[PDB]
Amino acid sequence: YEYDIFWAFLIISSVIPILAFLFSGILAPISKGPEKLSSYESGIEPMGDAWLQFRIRYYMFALVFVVFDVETVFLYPWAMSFDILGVSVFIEALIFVLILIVGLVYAWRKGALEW
Amino acid sequence: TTRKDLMIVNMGPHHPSMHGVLRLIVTLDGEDVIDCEPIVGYLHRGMEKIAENRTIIQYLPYVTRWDYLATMFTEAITVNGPEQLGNIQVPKRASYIRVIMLELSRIASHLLWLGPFMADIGAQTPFFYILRERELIYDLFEAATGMRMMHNYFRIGGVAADLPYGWIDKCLDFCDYFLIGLTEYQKLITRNPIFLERVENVGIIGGEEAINWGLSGPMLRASGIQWDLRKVDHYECYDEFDWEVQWQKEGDSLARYLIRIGEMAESVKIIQQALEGIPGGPYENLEIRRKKPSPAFELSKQELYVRVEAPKGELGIFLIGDQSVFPWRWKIRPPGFINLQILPQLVKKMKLADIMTILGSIDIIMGEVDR
Amino acid sequence: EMKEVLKRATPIEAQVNVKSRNLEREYGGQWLSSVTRHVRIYAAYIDPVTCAMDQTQMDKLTLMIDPTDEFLWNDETLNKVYVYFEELVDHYEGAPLTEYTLRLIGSDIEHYIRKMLYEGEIKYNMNSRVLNFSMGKPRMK
Amino acid sequence: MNSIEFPLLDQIAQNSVISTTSNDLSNWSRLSSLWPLLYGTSCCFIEFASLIGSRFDFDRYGLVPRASPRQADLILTAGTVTMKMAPSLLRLYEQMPEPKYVIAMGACTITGGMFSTDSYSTVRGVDKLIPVDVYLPGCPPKPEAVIDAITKLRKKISREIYEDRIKSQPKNRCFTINHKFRVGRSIHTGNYDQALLYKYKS
Amino acid sequence: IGIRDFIGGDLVKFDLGTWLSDVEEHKAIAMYSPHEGGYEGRYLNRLRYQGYHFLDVSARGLGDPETTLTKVHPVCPPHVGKQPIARWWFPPEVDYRLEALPSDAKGLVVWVIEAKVLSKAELQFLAMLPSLRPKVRVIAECGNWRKVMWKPLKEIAGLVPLQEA
Amino acid sequence: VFIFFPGILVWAPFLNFRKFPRDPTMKYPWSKPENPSEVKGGFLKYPWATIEDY
Amino acid sequence: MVTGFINYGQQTIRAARYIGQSFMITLSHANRLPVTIQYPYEKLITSERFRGRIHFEFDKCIACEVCVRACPIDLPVVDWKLETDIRKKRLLNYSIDFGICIFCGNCVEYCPTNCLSMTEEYELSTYDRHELNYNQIALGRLPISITDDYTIRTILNSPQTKE
Amino acid sequence: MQGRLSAWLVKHGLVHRSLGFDYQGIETLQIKPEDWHSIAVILYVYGYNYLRSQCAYDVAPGGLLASVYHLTRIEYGVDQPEEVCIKVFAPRRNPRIPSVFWVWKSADFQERESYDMFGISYDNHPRLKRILMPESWIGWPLRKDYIVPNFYEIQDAY
Amino acid sequence: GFIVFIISSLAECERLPFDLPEAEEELVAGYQTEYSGIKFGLFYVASYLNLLISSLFVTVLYLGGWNLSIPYIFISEFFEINKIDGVFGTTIGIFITLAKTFLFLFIPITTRWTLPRLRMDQLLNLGWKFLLPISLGNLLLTTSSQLFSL
Amino acid sequence: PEYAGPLGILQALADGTKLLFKENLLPSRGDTYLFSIGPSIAVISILLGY
Ligand code: SF4
Ligand code: SF4
Ligand code: SF4
Structure with a gap:
């Protein structure tokens, strides 16, 4: 079957990091110390714990990416059935690509894709 | 957005872009630099205090430890302070040798600026490319002075020793090869689209701001100001050679890069002209050269200020004597220490990745910023 | 004769379930500590069993002597160093928690350690990772 | 008399094939990939840069410089360590994972060098801060001398056994008391050149 | 020369029994190793497995090894002009380490690095040291080679004629 | 090398490519040259050398 | 409107050309011989005035201690006593610690008897710091020239130019 | 002889004192600390574009602390620029000198160095804190009567 | 699509000039800053495996894969290569695929430097x-x- | 790479075995589970494309 190899390969690929972690645990020594476990901050003592809180206008491309992922997912089955059918699916997906282009133009002009 | 939204990161002494042990406390608002605070002094060895309680012949090894890339400039300022105080003349051959060594050190300093600058931009190969020829410069220095760095070659009223046999042709061949190498560097780097788009419009400095902030050298000359202390103060024999002061009108980092490339080319021209017209005669001053107890140079009782055009700007020495071997006061005016204070103004409202470009545009090495 | 070194330095009562915490935003960026190969004085609560350091507890001074063992330590020598540390801390009452004060305290503590080594109280630790004798080579009197 | 003393220990192990060859191969692997910290402080780092460059190659020994301490085996201390920098140096050494090695390069890292006499802030040798395996004398040591020091470090690394691992973990003794000092916030808060034009106060 | 030269210089060879037999028979051994180092630890490791404790001696700053190793020697710590000249006396290094070793140790092995800088007579004394101190083995790197080869140190120093290998 | 690396990973532990001594007479590291003048000392590098100097 | 697209075209081809130019400039270095000096199998021959380990002649020393005063740190230790029969300074011990030495060259320059010399002996690394305290016997050892080691390829930096 | 700047100041009625010249003949003037903040603006008005260096030094141990300013002009078409040295003296017990950061920004770091090494407090400097020494340090190292308080890592490497 | 696929795959493999999350000069090591031991090796393997799989998908999707023949020309060598079938044909196909993969492994390795x-x-x-x-x-x-x- | 093997062939193997023998370092301030899971997820999702 064409998919039992997929499951076996997935199991092996998940097992490999477990084997690496086990081998490191049984081979590498442990010498923990309070200075060693401190977070690295280029020598100096770290201040408050991490955290940046970006601006919204920077990370507004993600809302475009969510929609565009769905559009590119929807475009695949049409391409798979483009040869069995004819110009009907061409006309069908032309509106999809045109709406994608119009949305990209709107995001470009409104400044959503500006950093 | 005042607090708990602003990330204060200590891009401190251990950072690849931080040249040496410079620390920046950078406050970021989503990769946007709100401001930065420079903390220096991680290499403060108290060299001004060690300048006292040391004779000049003892303090000369200490001199090369500020601006360790351009060591001959610091050696020149240290040996020309007291020799101006004592009215000691320098022979013409020694002056020509000094000019040649200073220009070679300027070439090496501009190279080892270009390396870390392009590394901070993102290109690592130019570092090895500059080191291929800085090793040749080191070979010339070791053939002449005896060591690659920390030469201890400059002396009061002259130099340590004459140039060895077969040095002029070696230096001329180095100049011929290095011109080709510089053309290769400009072919690889100067018009690159990524390099330009990382450099073209960062750190715009006005000429008035450059004057007020105390900037000197390629920093001040990259704001529309043609101010070189070699042609203003008539240092050594720079009035005899044909050379041009490299200055640019725009204030960005690209102007500084172009200025340093042109300064390397003009320096090469200066070595060629100096070696073509080298004079004869003595090099050490025979008047000062005189088991018996040997005193050092007793400085006169007056104040003095001496300047030099270091590759990083203007390097100065304020010397107050005390009619004794040990100077009463020895203040060092470092070009990098004064060029660094404009960095928070430049990086304000810029981005995090632009800090590397701005700091690489300024020729800062931490051994000269503190003393 | 007698017991001697009867001060018997009393540590603070041991806490449980102490978790590692960084310094706050206003108090961060500073060392509030003196670290050196033989002495680490931290303005923090460090427990040895779980290697957890709480740096928000600035009212406690944790002293770790000889983390990389260069001397062989008995309990009496540890008690001597600890009573000296307590006396030094009580001597500096009213001083700020800055790095300067803790570095001074560590300097006197290491001078005491060197005096103990040269008096015969402690000996250099063989079977150490390095043998460099940072306090001086073995010499005769 | 500053005497020396060997503590009480047990017998090692003794093995035929598995443990001995595994230890030898681990030693060989740690020989050829001693990744430096890229720790640079002062003029000696320039010569360190000359060992990254083309004329003398770091890559022949492996020895790729890694910025993060967690990815670095060897710290090659190049430069004078001031009082302001020494706690940072000790942190960086402590944050490096075991096994870790230290090479003190330069006269300023062994004993303070020129600053051993009159400098009021120069630490006279990092052996007062970090345990040094190989001492490298010389002001700007020649890059070949740096390679020789690294070769001697490899000579000592290949001699290691499993017992040396329990020589490397810290003993981790602590002692906690109240201090009744004055607690003060950090002077360097990060506020710099913000609203500067309103700070005249005539 | 080739063939054998370009064939495996691998570190899995069975030379180790011969190495231990030679270091037990010939007390003082001159060793030659790869220039980049690190292939000596395979041979010193088994010596350390037998209970031998290593004393690392640098031959550059050795300074007349007779009184440096087998006698109390005077050394002046470096004053930098802040102190008067002091004359310290240091214990004999190899004998101090011998008398301070634990009773279960097989002995002490003196690892003399960079022994090429020593003269002929210093190598003579380094070869004849185990005769005076029974529980001392001498290992001295007298050079470098493509592969690890060892010889008796008396042969290199000139006490025994150099037999062709 | 990229194609045949699975076959090179086996042979590499059983091969050494360490550079040979300058004179082709040094049978042993303790051997002395017959006449120490026929050796070629002073190999140059890339700025001033040909392929003969390697 | 079309001119904007045309300008976008010409400012894109230029970037591709300059990226290819960077690629060509970098890859032209593959046809050039390496500059790397393969230490420790190859050693660079030091200059005639290279400042390395000090060599000290015990017979020529007069214990005048000017080498101490000329030192930036007063490093050399000259333990001497007066030989009352002749009233000349008899040298007892001479020691230079190379952990503090910076190889500046002041001692070898200001020595009146010229008993102090600079050798080519670099690579003085030791495992122990206190082993760097060279006395008058260690300083008196002749340096090992790399030209006498025949297992390595001695590299000369430049042509000899003695013609 | 009266310098050009001193003659200009006496023409404009500004109090000062001429201390002479250095070895290069540059004028040296002494300005009282109370008038220095007003005189610096007038100095820039004269045309001193460039604050070349700001320095501080000890006149004598247990004596006055002197702060030194070097000034020159950066202009197109001037052959020999005019340079002036100016010294302001403050008592050791409580040294107070007005800051020229609001006239020349180049003093921004430099005066901090003068505060870090000699303890001269500058009034209108907005960020006056230690720059070279550690920020928690107590004492001014460059004063002639300073004594280092016996730190362990400064002592001899034993 | 060939150029855009190359640029996009180089960005997804996070190779330079798209090494921003692991940019050593801006951040100390990026997301690998606190990672030590076998985990850094895992985040190294994954990167090189992404590079290899991107090169393989370049030679599969846009190059001919294991195919090497010119039917429109009388290329004797290519026709003789394509005439082989069996174990030897599969071996030659693997060789061709590895060579075409190595071309677009050579290009980005150069691109980084x-x-x-x-x-x-x-x-x-x-x-x-x-x-x-x-x-x-x-x-x-x-x-x-x-x-x-x- | 020249010394780890004949022509540096064993250099990457040496790096891998060194990282195997290098102490596994976990952050005390952060989360252990996410720290251990992240690289494993990345390598699994990258290996699944082969
Ligand atoms: S040896 Fe010391 S003083 Fe000399 S350059 Fe190196 S760090 Fe600076
Ligand atoms: S200067 Fe020369 S002769 Fe005088 S004490 Fe020093 S080494 Fe001896
Ligand atoms: S070389 Fe210089 S530093 Fe060394 S001992 Fe001589 S004078 Fe002192």
């Missing part, structure tokens, strides 16, 4: 304003050309 690295804003601009509309136009051209097939 030649160009400077991008910036985050410019990375976003290149991804969203230069590559996406161009890929949409390429898809439209592909569909228009494929209209002739049916």
Whole structure:
């Protein structure tokens, strides 16, 4: 079957990091110390714990990416059935690509894709 | 957005872009630099205090430890302070040798600026490319002075020793090869689209701001100001050679890069002209050269200020004597220490990745910023 | 004769379930500590069993002597160093928690350690990772 | 008399094939990939840069410089360590994972060098801060001398056994008391050149 | 020369029994190793497995090894002009380490690095040291080679004629 | 090398490519040259050398 | 409107050309011989005035201690006593610690008897710091020239130019 | 002889004192600390574009602390620029000198160095804190009567 | 589509000039800053495996894969190569695939050591304003050309 | 790479075995589970494409 190899390969690929972690645990020594476990901050003592809180206008491309992922997912089955059918699916997906282009133009002009 | 939204990161002494042990406390608002605070002094060895309680012949090894890339400039300022105080003349051959060594050190300093600058931009190969020829410069220095760095070659009223046999042709061949190498560097780097788009419009400095902030050298000359202390103060024999002061009108980092490339080319021209017209005669001053107890140079009782055009700007020495071997006061005016204070103004409202470009545009090495 | 070194330095009562915490935003960026190969004085609560350091507890001074063992330590020598540390801390009452004060305290503590080594109280630790004798080579009197 | 003393220990192990060859191969692997910290402080780092460059190659020994301490085996201390920098140096050494090695390069890292006499802030040798395996004398040591020091470090690394691992973990003794000092916030808060034009106060 | 030269210089060879037999028979051994180092630890490791404790001696700053190793020697710590000249006396290094070793140790092995800088007579004394101190083995790197080869140190120093290998 | 690396990973532990001594007479590291003048000392590098100097 | 697209075209081809130019400039270095000096199998021959380990002649020393005063740190230790029969300074011990030495060259320059010399002996690394305290016997050892080691390829930096 | 700047100041009625010249003949003037903040603006008005260096030094141990300013002009078409040295003296017990950061920004770091090494407090400097020494340090190292308080890592490497 | 696939795969493999999350000069090591031991090796393997799989997908999707033949010309060598079938044919196909993969392994390894690295804003601009509309136009051209097939 | 093997062939193997023998370092301030899971997820999702 064409998919039992997929499951076996997935199991092996998940097992490999477990084997690496086990081998490191049984081979590498442990010498923990309070200075060693401190977070690295280029020598100096770290201040408050991490955290940046970006601006919204920077990370507004993600809302475009969510929609565009769905559009590119929807475009695949049409391409798979483009040869069995004819110009009907061409006309069908032309509106999809045109709406994608119009949305990209709107995001470009409104400044959503500006950093 | 005042607090708990602003990330204060200590891009401190251990950072690849931080040249040496410079620390920046950078406050970021989503990769946007709100401001930065420079903390220096991680290499403060108290060299001004060690300048006292040391004779000049003892303090000369200490001199090369500020601006360790351009060591001959610091050696020149240290040996020309007291020799101006004592009215000691320098022979013409020694002056020509000094000019040649200073220009070679300027070439090496501009190279080892270009390396870390392009590394901070993102290109690592130019570092090895500059080191291929800085090793040749080191070979010339070791053939002449005896060591690659920390030469201890400059002396009061002259130099340590004459140039060895077969040095002029070696230096001329180095100049011929290095011109080709510089053309290769400009072919690889100067018009690159990524390099330009990382450099073209960062750190715009006005000429008035450059004057007020105390900037000197390629920093001040990259704001529309043609101010070189070699042609203003008539240092050594720079009035005899044909050379041009490299200055640019725009204030960005690209102007500084172009200025340093042109300064390397003009320096090469200066070595060629100096070696073509080298004079004869003595090099050490025979008047000062005189088991018996040997005193050092007793400085006169007056104040003095001496300047030099270091590759990083203007390097100065304020010397107050005390009619004794040990100077009463020895203040060092470092070009990098004064060029660094404009960095928070430049990086304000810029981005995090632009800090590397701005700091690489300024020729800062931490051994000269503190003393 | 007698017991001697009867001060018997009393540590603070041991806490449980102490978790590692960084310094706050206003108090961060500073060392509030003196670290050196033989002495680490931290303005923090460090427990040895779980290697957890709480740096928000600035009212406690944790002293770790000889983390990389260069001397062989008995309990009496540890008690001597600890009573000296307590006396030094009580001597500096009213001083700020800055790095300067803790570095001074560590300097006197290491001078005491060197005096103990040269008096015969402690000996250099063989079977150490390095043998460099940072306090001086073995010499005769 | 500053005497020396060997503590009480047990017998090692003794093995035929598995443990001995595994230890030898681990030693060989740690020989050829001693990744430096890229720790640079002062003029000696320039010569360190000359060992990254083309004329003398770091890559022949492996020895790729890694910025993060967690990815670095060897710290090659190049430069004078001031009082302001020494706690940072000790942190960086402590944050490096075991096994870790230290090479003190330069006269300023062994004993303070020129600053051993009159400098009021120069630490006279990092052996007062970090345990040094190989001492490298010389002001700007020649890059070949740096390679020789690294070769001697490899000579000592290949001699290691499993017992040396329990020589490397810290003993981790602590002692906690109240201090009744004055607690003060950090002077360097990060506020710099913000609203500067309103700070005249005539 | 080739063939054998370009064939495996691998570190899995069975030379180790011969190495231990030679270091037990010939007390003082001159060793030659790869220039980049690190292939000596395979041979010193088994010596350390037998209970031998290593004393690392640098031959550059050795300074007349007779009184440096087998006698109390005077050394002046470096004053930098802040102190008067002091004359310290240091214990004999190899004998101090011998008398301070634990009773279960097989002995002490003196690892003399960079022994090429020593003269002929210093190598003579380094070869004849185990005769005076029974529980001392001498290992001295007298050079470098493509592969690890060892010889008796008396042969290199000139006490025994150099037999062709 | 990229194609045949699975076959090179086996042979590499059983091969050494360490550079040979300058004179082709040094049978042993303790051997002395017959006449120490026929050796070629002073190999140059890339700025001033040909392929003969390697 | 079309001119904007045309300008976008010409400012894109230029970037591709300059990226290819960077690629060509970098890859032209593959046809050039390496500059790397393969230490420790190859050693660079030091200059005639290279400042390395000090060599000290015990017979020529007069214990005048000017080498101490000329030192930036007063490093050399000259333990001497007066030989009352002749009233000349008899040298007892001479020691230079190379952990503090910076190889500046002041001692070898200001020595009146010229008993102090600079050798080519670099690579003085030791495992122990206190082993760097060279006395008058260690300083008196002749340096090992790399030209006498025949297992390595001695590299000369430049042509000899003695013609 | 009266310098050009001193003659200009006496023409404009500004109090000062001429201390002479250095070895290069540059004028040296002494300005009282109370008038220095007003005189610096007038100095820039004269045309001193460039604050070349700001320095501080000890006149004598247990004596006055002197702060030194070097000034020159950066202009197109001037052959020999005019340079002036100016010294302001403050008592050791409580040294107070007005800051020229609001006239020349180049003093921004430099005066901090003068505060870090000699303890001269500058009034209108907005960020006056230690720059070279550690920020928690107590004492001014460059004063002639300073004594280092016996730190362990400064002592001899034993 | 070939150029856009190369640039996009180089960005996904996070190779330079798109090494921003692991940019050593801006951040100390990026997300690998606190990672030590076997985990850094895992995040190294994964990167090189991504590079290898991107090169393999380049030689599969855009190059001919294991195929090497010119039917329109009388190439004796290519015809004789394609005439082999069996174990030897599969071996030659593996050889051809590995060579074509090594071409687009050689190119990005060079690319890392030649160009400077991008910036985050410019990375976003290149991804969203230069590559996406161009890929949409390429898809439209592909569909228009494929209209002739049916 | 020249010394780890004949022509540096064993250099990457030496790096891998060194990282195997290098102490596994976990952050005390952060989360252990996410720290251990992240690289494993990355390598699994990258290996699944082969
Ligand atoms: S040896 Fe010391 S003083 Fe000399 S350059 Fe190196 S760090 Fe600076
Ligand atoms: S200067 Fe020369 S002769 Fe005088 S004490 Fe020093 S080494 Fe001896
Ligand atoms: S070389 Fe210089 S530093 Fe060394 S001992 Fe001589 S004078 Fe002192």
